[PDB]
């Protein structure tokens, strides 16, 4: 196929070359004793019949996630106390209204 029709390089070799196909009906001389159904599948495909560019569906790539089971939470229960201030030194919760990193004050002793 690549000799005449340029391709998108994602096609398989079975579409790059029709010579791999061999189960198709070969051509004999026509005779009086003929069946009208022998039009179907009469001849092997030549070079000008296979499509250039092929787009599969790769359904196993999602089936491998589908068959295992959908993601679920089963007592992965934790809650972390988090603060609004940016500093790692200070963790002020809404419940605990107290300042952290106590002030080293010269004059007044111990708050």
């Amino acid at each position: 196929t690549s000799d005449y029709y340029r391709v998108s390089a994602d096609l398989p070799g079975r579409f790059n070359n029709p010579g791999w196909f061999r189960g198709y009906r070969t051509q004999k001389a026509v005779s009086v004793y003929r069946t009208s159904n022998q039009a179907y599948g009469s001849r092997a495909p030549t070079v000008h019949e296979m499509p250039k560019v092929f787009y599969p569906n790769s359904n196993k790539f999602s089936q491998q996630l589908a068959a295992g089971g959908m993601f679920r939470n089963n007592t992965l229960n934790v809650y972390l106390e988090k603060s609004i201030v940016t500093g790692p030194d200070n963790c002020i919760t809404s419940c605990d209204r107290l300042n952290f990193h106590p002030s080293y004050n010269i004059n007044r002793p111990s708050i």
Partner: peptide, 27 residues
């Protein structure tokens, strides 16, 4: 039967599958 023969010949030539049943195994 005639419609199905036409449709299945079309499907085999569309999906690149030999009349023997199997795909050409050389990709």
């Amino acid at each position: 039967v005639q419609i199905g023969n036409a449709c299945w010949e079309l499907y085999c030539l569309e999906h690149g599958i030999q009349p023997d049943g199997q795909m050409p195994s050389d990709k």
